[PDB]
Amino acid sequence: KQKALAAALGQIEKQFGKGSIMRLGEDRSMDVETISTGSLSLDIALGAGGLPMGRIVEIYGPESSGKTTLTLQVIAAAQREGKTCAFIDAEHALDPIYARKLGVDIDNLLCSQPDTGEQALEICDALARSGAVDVIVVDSVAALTPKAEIEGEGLAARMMSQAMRKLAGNLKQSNTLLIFINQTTGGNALKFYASVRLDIRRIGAVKEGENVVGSETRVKVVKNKIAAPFKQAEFQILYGEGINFYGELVDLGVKEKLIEKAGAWYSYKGEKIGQGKANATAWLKDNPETAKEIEKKVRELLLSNP
Amino acid sequence: KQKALAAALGQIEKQFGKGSIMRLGEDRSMDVETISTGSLSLDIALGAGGLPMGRIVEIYGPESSGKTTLTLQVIAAAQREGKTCAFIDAEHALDPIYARKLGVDIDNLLCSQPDTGEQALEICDALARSGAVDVIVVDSVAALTPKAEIEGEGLAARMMSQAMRKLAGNLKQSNTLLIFINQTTGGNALKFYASVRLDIRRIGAVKEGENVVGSETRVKVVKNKIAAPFKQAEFQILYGEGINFYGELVDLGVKEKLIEKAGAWYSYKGEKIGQGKANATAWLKDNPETAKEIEKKVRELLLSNP
Amino acid sequence: KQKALAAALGQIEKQFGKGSIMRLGEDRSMDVETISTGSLSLDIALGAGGLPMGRIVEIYGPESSGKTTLTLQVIAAAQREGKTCAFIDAEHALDPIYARKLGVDIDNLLCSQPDTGEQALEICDALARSGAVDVIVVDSVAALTPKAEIEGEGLAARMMSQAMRKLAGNLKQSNTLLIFINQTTGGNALKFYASVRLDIRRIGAVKEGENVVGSETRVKVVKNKIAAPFKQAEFQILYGEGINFYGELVDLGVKEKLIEKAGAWYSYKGEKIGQGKANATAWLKDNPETAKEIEKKVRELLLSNP
Amino acid sequence: KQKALAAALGQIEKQFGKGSIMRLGEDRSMDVETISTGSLSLDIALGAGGLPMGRIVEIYGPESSGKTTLTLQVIAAAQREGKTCAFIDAEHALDPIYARKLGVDIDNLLCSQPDTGEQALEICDALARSGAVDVIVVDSVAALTPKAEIEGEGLAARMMSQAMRKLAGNLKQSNTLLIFINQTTGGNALKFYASVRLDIRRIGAVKEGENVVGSETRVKVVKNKIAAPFKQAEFQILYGEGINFYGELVDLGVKEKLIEKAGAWYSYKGEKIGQGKANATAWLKDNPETAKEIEKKVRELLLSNP
Amino acid sequence: KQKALAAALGQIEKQFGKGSIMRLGEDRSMDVETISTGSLSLDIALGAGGLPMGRIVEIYGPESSGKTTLTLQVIAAAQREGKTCAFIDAEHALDPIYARKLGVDIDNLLCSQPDTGEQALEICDALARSGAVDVIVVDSVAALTPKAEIEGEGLAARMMSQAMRKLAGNLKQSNTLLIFINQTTGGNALKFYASVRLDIRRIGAVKEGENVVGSETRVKVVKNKIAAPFKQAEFQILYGEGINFYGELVDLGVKEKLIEKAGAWYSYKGEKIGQGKANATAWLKDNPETAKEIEKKVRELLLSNP
Amino acid sequence: KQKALAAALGQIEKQFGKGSIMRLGEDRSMDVETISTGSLSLDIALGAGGLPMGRIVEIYGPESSGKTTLTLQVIAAAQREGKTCAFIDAEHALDPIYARKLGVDIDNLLCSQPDTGEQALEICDALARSGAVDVIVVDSVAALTPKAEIEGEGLAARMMSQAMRKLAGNLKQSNTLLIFINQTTGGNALKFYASVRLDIRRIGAVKEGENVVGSETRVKVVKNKIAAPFKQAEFQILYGEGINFYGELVDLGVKEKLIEKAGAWYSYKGEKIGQGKANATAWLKDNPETAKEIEKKVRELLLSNP
Ligand SMILES: [Ca+2]
Ligand SMILES: [Ca+2]
Ligand SMILES: [Ca+2]
Ligand SMILES: [Ca+2]
Ligand SMILES: [Ca+2]
Ligand SMILES: [Ca+2]
Ligand SMILES: [Ca+2]
Ligand SMILES: [Ca+2]
Ligand SMILES: [Ca+2]
Ligand SMILES: [Ca+2]
Ligand SMILES: [Ca+2]
Ligand SMILES: [Ca+2]
Ligand SMILES: [Ca+2]
Ligand SMILES: [Ca+2]
Ligand SMILES: [Ca+2]
Ligand SMILES: [Ca+2]
Ligand SMILES: [Ca+2]
Ligand SMILES: [Ca+2]
């Protein structure tokens, strides 16, 4: 019965490798170093608690979907840990003012604005082989124009395929995380080589009465080779501020029974934290020590770990 | 006369096997274990009352045709019986929220997101040989990219042909049902190895006045080796709910004279069930015991059995 | 002069057989049992008044050319006479709803959906040898995939050639008519073994103002061994109805001076039948006895008989 | 000098036969009965004024090159003289509607659609021996499939070689002209046994502003044993009409100074015939007596006769 | 650590060239001759202190964004240095009155109003090859209509791509600066060949109470291959006057602690310059020697130089 | 030393005949009458200045290699001298229009289109014995089908061997030149009996910008018994014009220092002839007297004569 199945799946993983197959509800994950996305719900949706070092990740969605914010939050989180980041740009749209607001150390951010799509990929491969960079962000796949097209002479897909295998191997060896931002364009190479694929969309507005101050966002983990796929995350992205992390903390804290909200006050460990979600959120922001403890517990309860 | 024909067809079946030839109107079917599709009219169209264990089935149609819903309903029906299901995914589009609404036990659903089209087929074959899985769903044939294509080096058809014979044999031996979702692409291997091929399409909208709440669906059984082919099924797929099974039950109940609808009330066995099809449908939903009896009778009258 | 030629041709037929040579304008035909095509003009184009029992016939044309309709009309006409029909299918596209509208007795139609192109031909041969089937329809030559191709291992032509001689002999002996639907593919075997080859095409639309309700069709008898070849037929195929037989009857009736149309009314034997071709057509439909007599006369005047 | 050469060539012809050698510019031709090709320029290119009775002729070219039209015009010209024609068909593509437009008496045209390439040749030989047919047209060499090939068991070349010698001898004895249409395929037998070989091609379009109504055609007499070889002919083939004979008459009439075109009018024998080539052409068409006289003179001036 | 990174980046630059990658905060720049934009903040944003000779620059933005003013200020600055400028016009909108107010020497400005988009590019290439012109301004990309479009027969993108490579090479060789004004249209050729791309927009109005006398402008350096990209510049464009350079000088002087403004007076090197920013601005305008010294210091402190 | 060798070689020639052995660089040649090939460089490569009367020559190469042009130029050159030419054709591909453009007098060209390969050779032998023909061209060896093959009953080689000895003897006696065009096929008879064998190939295209107007040709004298073998010739064959003789004259004139080209003008004997090779070529074409003198000198300097 159970043994027969467990033994069968074992054979599958033995022949095809770890992560080749799993029950969507299992609390299993690869032992990979991760970098936070800046979103607690997304970190949980990823199972491993963040994006995996040494792998290829694809983040796609419509313009203004939030992929820009997400990408910058990842860079900021990485730099926070002392990790070196490189931005390979073919979009020419980085906003350093917004980036700094999200905590990005722009002064120390490495940047290249390649002459062709092929050159952009070659630079990524060189950086991957160097083992001197921790995170590489490519903005974006759709903008990586093949040299032949630029000169006005399927091509994009061919360009991606010819570089992906070597890139993936070099990234794994140096434990470098590479994120491809997309809108997906580029062919099947990225789709199959990616260890994680994120579908991000704006599903509504955040208002302060009549004034729109943010966006309701939803990210679906459509592909995940480090933990079970298909979980999703919903959170708010506030203009000029980024992901409303504390709002997520309150919601998850309440859902997991860590934060109580019956009666006139929300409370944690029996202590008052605020009247209403807003005040409770602001309180956690003003009390990092407690916020940190709640986050730790939420991760312990919801991450896909043994 | 009649004897001469019966004797001739017998020779055909003796030489070519059972199901090699039959009159489209005969009440004959193979003695195979089946899994419901979630649609009463389709189960009837299949003759045997559901999809056949141990065989290969192809379900194809345009995007949003309803093949997704149909596939999930099959998984849910199978799990309902305690059967183990595996989802081999190359589309990266499963929606667990909608799946749970259809009754799918996502937590216990096995899932693989293969690195190549060839790997996906090898995993299917391994699972088939293990005899530890009851239902395998492959989404989708069009997405099974050959390794050579992924690397940017007829190929898809060759990939399918090289695996089909062995896969079919292994599935039959372990009595594992495998469903290939398609849009058909892949060549002739699947077309000829499949025991059942379903053509599903959206033929209209279901409205509640001005608001669209569902789709009118039609499924044609274009190939059927377990019972007579070419029957069709029409039913509604309601957004967020799935196949309107009870609506089918009312329609078939009325057509088969089991449900009376003259006068002010619809009735069964002389008892009032509702005024109007809608109320009658809701009533059957609220009275499973009666609904179950009506379904049993409908199957007794319309399934292709001795 | 005339005698010298008649004597010469006689020698040709004596050495090579009846139908080996003839003047295209001669009123000669083989004494074969025939089945109507559902089209009066085509039955006339065939010279013998229909398709020949015991022979091989090829009907080819583009998709939506009308070959499907034509094939179903033949089956319906045959069943009308109490003849047994078998449908050997490798296309998986039969539409029983449309078939019933054309008069096909689907319930009594025998059907096989072979596993390979070779198996399909072997089943045809077995049925031919049994002498228990009157008409066999194969849909289609292009879809009869050789086993080697299905397994992904000139082949199609070889497959057809290896079976044709034996099939033709068995069909002749049991007086079974076999129709191969094609698009021609398959090699030269069918081309030379066929007693009749029909080229069917859609040459325009039939409209009711701005709405298209049918197709103008043209069938050319490119090969005919039962009567003189190369005659053609033009008729309409109306959606959901089939061949507009009565429209043909009116046209041929008028051309042969059987139906008068001068003045305000069309007439037959001096009796009013309608004002305008449309009304005259509807009238014949409402008066089968008169329609039957007109058809009989048209055949007497236009069929290639002594 | 001159005598030495004339005496030498005489010896060649004495040893090898008449037509074994000649100066390409000599006005010499065999005294053979001929049939017009329907083209004045081609009749002239042939030297003898038409195709030779009792000999084998090959007409080859791409599909739509005009060989079909040319072949039908020959049949029509022959029938015009009361000659009996036979069409041996393995292509199954004769269009009687177009044929009648070209003047072909379809009703009196003999036709055979042989079962094999060998049978087709045997029928040609039988007809040749009968002496009851004047013209035989074989469509086409490429379509004459050897029996062994049809049954799926160099062969075509062998088939042609085994029949050519006897066929040529029988045709000569009965003074029967045989034309092989080709695309050349079949080996060397036809190439060497043919008394005339024609290479026909479409070299452009004939337009009426923006609408294409015909084709500019060119025929090269690549082999000619009845008169000097290598002359060519250019003429137009108008859709639904055939060879623009009168257009050729005007061109040749003008080139030979028979038709004057200086000033405002074209003229013949001093009489106005039209303003512009088009009107002049139409005029000749409306005045057969004058057209006939001009053609007679053109032939007197350009045919290769003593 | 640091060495490992420095060595890695060195390899990148060695393989891909100088400027292929850099930290956004580094004080590095290419040793290129530059021309001032007329804006101190923009000159600083450019890192090198102005636009680069021998390269292609793109300046884009909405109508009335200020790109016109910026372009004219560049020409005026260039002419001030004795450099020869050419204006390639397809917009037909130059205002010489406003141009002269900005310091442009219209009388000596070369001008072409090309007949087609292709001709405009060919003239640019010819001028680039001549080495007789220092600055070329093209107004504008959107207005360069391909000849085929003009004649009413992707095309624009193809036109740009076919000329860009050769143009870039010729410009570099003669050290000619070329500026393409755009709104971006034209395809990817310009985007990748440009060494600098400027995004300019009007972000507000400048008022003198109730009267609007200018525009608040913002320029973002979205692409920069001569120094680190993404810096921005904000300044005012006053109607009939151009860029408020002295206003920028005061702001930057104050920000860099060069200009003191505590108490009742603004001061430099301890000397009073004015009460209020306006008076301080006017003072610098009236005292070029001091203004020049302050600008020199600001550049020393803010330009990206070793 | 030198004497010992000269005496030894003398013995060789005495025993085996003149031309049995020679130093490849010697200026020696047989005193045979020659006919120009139409190519100055080839005439020089032949050593004797043209093809030898009374001998057998083989010219072989791929289709479109230029052998056709070369062969026609030889005929034209011969006829120019009042010599009688005969064309023995088994290819049926002569183009009189192109031939006339090359200067061939088609009207006076003798032509035979033999019934078999054996007959073709017998006719060549008869013409050779007659002593009434100066040049015989056989097109081609590959097309000379043995009678046994034509009838479908090593053979070709045997056919050639049985005729070669007698043919060679008869040709020598009447001083008739015979050229066999080939593709080599036919066996060893021709290879050893030929006094000259030419290998001709197309080695590139001649363009007028983007339009191809000719072919770069190379002819290698692989066998030469009238002068030293192995020299080669390169020249252009222009479509519709033939060998670019004047282009060769300019090249050889320049190489031999006869034509000067330093400075702004090419010159001969100090007189300007043109600016650039093209104009210089056209000039020589317009000034035959000077061209003739230059050719005479080139031959005096480069032909292999005492
Ligand atoms: Ca590292
Ligand atoms: Ca919320
Ligand atoms: Ca509380
Ligand atoms: Ca099992
Ligand atoms: Ca309904
Ligand atoms: Ca009731
Ligand atoms: Ca029977
Ligand atoms: Ca009609
Ligand atoms: Ca009437
Ligand atoms: Ca006769
Ligand atoms: Ca013309
Ligand atoms: Ca005149
Ligand atoms: Ca210069
Ligand atoms: Ca300001
Ligand atoms: Ca102060
Ligand atoms: Ca002589
Ligand atoms: Ca050259
Ligand atoms: Ca000179």
PDB file of N, CA and C in Angstrom, chain A residues 89-90 92 94 96-97 106-115 119 122-123 126 130 132 143 145 150-152, chain E residues 4-5 8-9 12 15-16 20-25 161 165 188-189 191-193 197 222-225 229-230 232:
ATOM      1  N   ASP A  89      21.013  45.097 -18.056  1.00  0.00           N
ATOM      2  CA  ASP A  89      19.896  45.847 -18.599  1.00  0.00           C
ATOM      3  C   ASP A  89      19.789  46.113 -20.097  1.00  0.00           C
ATOM      4  N   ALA A  90      18.641  45.738 -20.655  1.00  0.00           N
ATOM      5  CA  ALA A  90      18.345  45.955 -22.067  1.00  0.00           C
ATOM      6  C   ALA A  90      17.036  46.743 -22.180  1.00  0.00           C
ATOM      7  N   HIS A  92      16.566  49.705 -20.101  1.00  0.00           N
ATOM      8  CA  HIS A  92      16.931  51.101 -19.854  1.00  0.00           C
ATOM      9  C   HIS A  92      15.792  51.787 -19.103  1.00  0.00           C
ATOM     10  N   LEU A  94      15.564  51.396 -15.212  1.00  0.00           N
ATOM     11  CA  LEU A  94      15.786  51.349 -13.770  1.00  0.00           C
ATOM     12  C   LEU A  94      15.557  52.716 -13.139  1.00  0.00           C
ATOM     13  N   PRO A  96      16.496  54.474  -9.874  1.00  0.00           N
ATOM     14  CA  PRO A  96      17.308  54.471  -8.655  1.00  0.00           C
ATOM     15  C   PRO A  96      16.647  55.125  -7.448  1.00  0.00           C
ATOM     16  N   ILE A  97      15.766  56.090  -7.688  1.00  0.00           N
ATOM     17  CA  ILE A  97      15.084  56.757  -6.591  1.00  0.00           C
ATOM     18  C   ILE A  97      14.139  55.769  -5.919  1.00  0.00           C
ATOM     19  N   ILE A 106      22.199  51.230  -4.566  1.00  0.00           N
ATOM     20  CA  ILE A 106      22.508  51.529  -5.960  1.00  0.00           C
ATOM     21  C   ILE A 106      23.987  51.755  -6.216  1.00  0.00           C
ATOM     22  N   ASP A 107      24.652  52.494  -5.333  1.00  0.00           N
ATOM     23  CA  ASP A 107      26.074  52.764  -5.515  1.00  0.00           C
ATOM     24  C   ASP A 107      26.912  51.510  -5.715  1.00  0.00           C
ATOM     25  N   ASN A 108      26.553  50.428  -5.032  1.00  0.00           N
ATOM     26  CA  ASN A 108      27.305  49.184  -5.157  1.00  0.00           C
ATOM     27  C   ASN A 108      26.718  48.173  -6.134  1.00  0.00           C
ATOM     28  N   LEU A 109      25.654  48.559  -6.827  1.00  0.00           N
ATOM     29  CA  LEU A 109      25.031  47.666  -7.795  1.00  0.00           C
ATOM     30  C   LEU A 109      25.821  47.663  -9.102  1.00  0.00           C
ATOM     31  N   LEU A 110      26.223  46.480  -9.553  1.00  0.00           N
ATOM     32  CA  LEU A 110      26.951  46.357 -10.812  1.00  0.00           C
ATOM     33  C   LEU A 110      25.921  46.464 -11.934  1.00  0.00           C
ATOM     34  N   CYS A 111      26.298  47.086 -13.045  1.00  0.00           N
ATOM     35  CA  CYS A 111      25.357  47.247 -14.147  1.00  0.00           C
ATOM     36  C   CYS A 111      26.006  47.200 -15.520  1.00  0.00           C
ATOM     37  N   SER A 112      25.339  46.512 -16.440  1.00  0.00           N
ATOM     38  CA  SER A 112      25.781  46.397 -17.823  1.00  0.00           C
ATOM     39  C   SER A 112      24.572  46.696 -18.702  1.00  0.00           C
ATOM     40  N   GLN A 113      24.798  47.388 -19.813  1.00  0.00           N
ATOM     41  CA  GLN A 113      23.735  47.687 -20.773  1.00  0.00           C
ATOM     42  C   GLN A 113      24.336  47.182 -22.091  1.00  0.00           C
ATOM     43  N   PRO A 114      24.247  45.859 -22.323  1.00  0.00           N
ATOM     44  CA  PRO A 114      24.764  45.152 -23.499  1.00  0.00           C
ATOM     45  C   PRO A 114      24.336  45.690 -24.856  1.00  0.00           C
ATOM     46  N   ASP A 115      25.196  45.479 -25.847  1.00  0.00           N
ATOM     47  CA  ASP A 115      24.956  45.938 -27.212  1.00  0.00           C
ATOM     48  C   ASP A 115      24.026  45.036 -28.015  1.00  0.00           C
ATOM     49  N   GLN A 119      25.246  39.361 -26.563  1.00  0.00           N
ATOM     50  CA  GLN A 119      26.276  39.875 -25.674  1.00  0.00           C
ATOM     51  C   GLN A 119      25.790  39.851 -24.226  1.00  0.00           C
ATOM     52  N   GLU A 122      26.209  36.397 -22.936  1.00  0.00           N
ATOM     53  CA  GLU A 122      27.622  36.062 -22.768  1.00  0.00           C
ATOM     54  C   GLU A 122      28.174  36.709 -21.496  1.00  0.00           C
ATOM     55  N   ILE A 123      27.713  37.918 -21.195  1.00  0.00           N
ATOM     56  CA  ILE A 123      28.163  38.604 -19.991  1.00  0.00           C
ATOM     57  C   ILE A 123      27.627  37.872 -18.756  1.00  0.00           C
ATOM     58  N   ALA A 126      29.773  34.829 -18.291  1.00  0.00           N
ATOM     59  CA  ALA A 126      31.092  35.196 -17.790  1.00  0.00           C
ATOM     60  C   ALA A 126      31.013  35.480 -16.291  1.00  0.00           C
ATOM     61  N   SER A 130      32.797  33.399 -13.187  1.00  0.00           N
ATOM     62  CA  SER A 130      33.718  34.103 -12.301  1.00  0.00           C
ATOM     63  C   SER A 130      33.535  33.738 -10.831  1.00  0.00           C
ATOM     64  N   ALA A 132      32.206  35.458  -8.723  1.00  0.00           N
ATOM     65  CA  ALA A 132      32.405  36.686  -7.960  1.00  0.00           C
ATOM     66  C   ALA A 132      31.112  37.469  -7.759  1.00  0.00           C
ATOM     67  N   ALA A 143      13.405  42.138 -24.231  1.00  0.00           N
ATOM     68  CA  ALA A 143      14.276  43.197 -24.735  1.00  0.00           C
ATOM     69  C   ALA A 143      15.628  42.722 -25.254  1.00  0.00           C
ATOM     70  N   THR A 145      17.325  41.730 -27.835  1.00  0.00           N
ATOM     71  CA  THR A 145      17.244  41.636 -29.288  1.00  0.00           C
ATOM     72  C   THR A 145      18.457  40.969 -29.925  1.00  0.00           C
ATOM     73  N   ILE A 150      18.771  43.418 -34.804  1.00  0.00           N
ATOM     74  CA  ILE A 150      19.232  44.788 -34.618  1.00  0.00           C
ATOM     75  C   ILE A 150      19.775  45.323 -35.942  1.00  0.00           C
ATOM     76  N   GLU A 151      20.442  44.451 -36.693  1.00  0.00           N
ATOM     77  CA  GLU A 151      21.025  44.826 -37.977  1.00  0.00           C
ATOM     78  C   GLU A 151      20.006  44.743 -39.110  1.00  0.00           C
ATOM     79  N   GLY A 152      18.781  44.351 -38.771  1.00  0.00           N
ATOM     80  CA  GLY A 152      17.725  44.247 -39.762  1.00  0.00           C
ATOM     81  C   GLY A 152      17.990  43.188 -40.813  1.00  0.00           C
TER      82      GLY A 152
ATOM     83  N   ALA E   4      39.118  39.450  -5.912  1.00  0.00           N
ATOM     84  CA  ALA E   4      38.423  38.467  -6.734  1.00  0.00           C
ATOM     85  C   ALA E   4      37.407  39.129  -7.663  1.00  0.00           C
ATOM     86  N   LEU E   5      36.710  40.140  -7.157  1.00  0.00           N
ATOM     87  CA  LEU E   5      35.712  40.845  -7.952  1.00  0.00           C
ATOM     88  C   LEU E   5      36.377  41.743  -8.991  1.00  0.00           C
ATOM     89  N   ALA E   8      37.616  39.801 -11.764  1.00  0.00           N
ATOM     90  CA  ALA E   8      36.534  39.250 -12.577  1.00  0.00           C
ATOM     91  C   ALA E   8      35.994  40.295 -13.547  1.00  0.00           C
ATOM     92  N   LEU E   9      35.727  41.490 -13.028  1.00  0.00           N
ATOM     93  CA  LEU E   9      35.210  42.576 -13.852  1.00  0.00           C
ATOM     94  C   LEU E   9      36.228  42.956 -14.914  1.00  0.00           C
ATOM     95  N   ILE E  12      35.775  40.790 -17.757  1.00  0.00           N
ATOM     96  CA  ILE E  12      34.578  41.169 -18.499  1.00  0.00           C
ATOM     97  C   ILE E  12      34.910  42.305 -19.463  1.00  0.00           C
ATOM     98  N   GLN E  15      37.158  41.184 -22.352  1.00  0.00           N
ATOM     99  CA  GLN E  15      36.442  40.438 -23.379  1.00  0.00           C
ATOM    100  C   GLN E  15      35.386  41.263 -24.109  1.00  0.00           C
ATOM    101  N   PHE E  16      34.633  42.069 -23.367  1.00  0.00           N
ATOM    102  CA  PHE E  16      33.562  42.866 -23.961  1.00  0.00           C
ATOM    103  C   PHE E  16      33.842  44.355 -24.178  1.00  0.00           C
ATOM    104  N   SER E  20      31.554  48.017 -20.473  1.00  0.00           N
ATOM    105  CA  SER E  20      30.650  46.883 -20.607  1.00  0.00           C
ATOM    106  C   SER E  20      29.983  46.598 -19.260  1.00  0.00           C
ATOM    107  N   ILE E  21      30.636  47.007 -18.178  1.00  0.00           N
ATOM    108  CA  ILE E  21      30.086  46.797 -16.844  1.00  0.00           C
ATOM    109  C   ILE E  21      30.778  47.696 -15.820  1.00  0.00           C
ATOM    110  N   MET E  22      30.011  48.211 -14.863  1.00  0.00           N
ATOM    111  CA  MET E  22      30.570  49.068 -13.816  1.00  0.00           C
ATOM    112  C   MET E  22      29.600  49.247 -12.653  1.00  0.00           C
ATOM    113  N   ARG E  23      30.126  49.623 -11.489  1.00  0.00           N
ATOM    114  CA  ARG E  23      29.276  49.871 -10.330  1.00  0.00           C
ATOM    115  C   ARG E  23      28.672  51.240 -10.577  1.00  0.00           C
ATOM    116  N   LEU E  24      27.368  51.367 -10.367  1.00  0.00           N
ATOM    117  CA  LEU E  24      26.690  52.626 -10.616  1.00  0.00           C
ATOM    118  C   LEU E  24      27.250  53.804  -9.823  1.00  0.00           C
ATOM    119  N   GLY E  25      27.944  53.518  -8.726  1.00  0.00           N
ATOM    120  CA  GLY E  25      28.499  54.596  -7.925  1.00  0.00           C
ATOM    121  C   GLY E  25      29.958  54.940  -8.172  1.00  0.00           C
ATOM    122  N   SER E 161      17.792  50.224 -39.101  1.00  0.00           N
ATOM    123  CA  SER E 161      18.774  49.153 -38.941  1.00  0.00           C
ATOM    124  C   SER E 161      19.783  49.065 -40.078  1.00  0.00           C
ATOM    125  N   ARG E 165      24.688  50.767 -38.333  1.00  0.00           N
ATOM    126  CA  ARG E 165      26.047  50.249 -38.179  1.00  0.00           C
ATOM    127  C   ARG E 165      27.083  51.098 -38.899  1.00  0.00           C
ATOM    128  N   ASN E 188      14.932  48.785 -32.720  1.00  0.00           N
ATOM    129  CA  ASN E 188      16.005  48.569 -31.752  1.00  0.00           C
ATOM    130  C   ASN E 188      17.394  49.047 -32.149  1.00  0.00           C
ATOM    131  N   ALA E 189      17.601  49.334 -33.430  1.00  0.00           N
ATOM    132  CA  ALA E 189      18.917  49.768 -33.892  1.00  0.00           C
ATOM    133  C   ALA E 189      19.470  50.951 -33.097  1.00  0.00           C
ATOM    134  N   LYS E 191      18.377  52.204 -30.198  1.00  0.00           N
ATOM    135  CA  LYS E 191      18.436  51.855 -28.786  1.00  0.00           C
ATOM    136  C   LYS E 191      19.763  51.199 -28.389  1.00  0.00           C
ATOM    137  N   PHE E 192      20.265  50.300 -29.228  1.00  0.00           N
ATOM    138  CA  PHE E 192      21.511  49.606 -28.913  1.00  0.00           C
ATOM    139  C   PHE E 192      22.784  50.284 -29.409  1.00  0.00           C
ATOM    140  N   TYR E 193      22.689  51.056 -30.484  1.00  0.00           N
ATOM    141  CA  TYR E 193      23.866  51.748 -31.007  1.00  0.00           C
ATOM    142  C   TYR E 193      24.159  53.058 -30.268  1.00  0.00           C
ATOM    143  N   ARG E 197      21.228  57.796 -23.977  1.00  0.00           N
ATOM    144  CA  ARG E 197      19.807  57.955 -24.282  1.00  0.00           C
ATOM    145  C   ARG E 197      19.226  58.805 -23.158  1.00  0.00           C
ATOM    146  N   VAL E 222      18.775  57.353 -19.183  1.00  0.00           N
ATOM    147  CA  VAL E 222      18.405  55.938 -19.158  1.00  0.00           C
ATOM    148  C   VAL E 222      19.450  54.983 -19.725  1.00  0.00           C
ATOM    149  N   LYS E 223      20.349  55.494 -20.559  1.00  0.00           N
ATOM    150  CA  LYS E 223      21.428  54.667 -21.086  1.00  0.00           C
ATOM    151  C   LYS E 223      22.680  55.532 -21.124  1.00  0.00           C
ATOM    152  N   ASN E 224      23.795  54.995 -20.645  1.00  0.00           N
ATOM    153  CA  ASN E 224      25.040  55.753 -20.650  1.00  0.00           C
ATOM    154  C   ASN E 224      26.216  54.802 -20.717  1.00  0.00           C
ATOM    155  N   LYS E 225      26.950  54.871 -21.821  1.00  0.00           N
ATOM    156  CA  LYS E 225      28.110  54.021 -22.041  1.00  0.00           C
ATOM    157  C   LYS E 225      29.431  54.771 -21.829  1.00  0.00           C
ATOM    158  N   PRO E 229      25.149  54.920 -15.830  1.00  0.00           N
ATOM    159  CA  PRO E 229      23.808  55.364 -16.215  1.00  0.00           C
ATOM    160  C   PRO E 229      22.855  55.584 -15.041  1.00  0.00           C
ATOM    161  N   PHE E 230      21.670  56.067 -15.388  1.00  0.00           N
ATOM    162  CA  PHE E 230      20.554  56.297 -14.477  1.00  0.00           C
ATOM    163  C   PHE E 230      20.507  57.508 -13.564  1.00  0.00           C
ATOM    164  N   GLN E 232      19.831  61.500 -12.841  1.00  0.00           N
ATOM    165  CA  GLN E 232      18.813  62.368 -13.415  1.00  0.00           C
ATOM    166  C   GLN E 232      19.152  63.826 -13.153  1.00  0.00           C
TER     167      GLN E 232
END
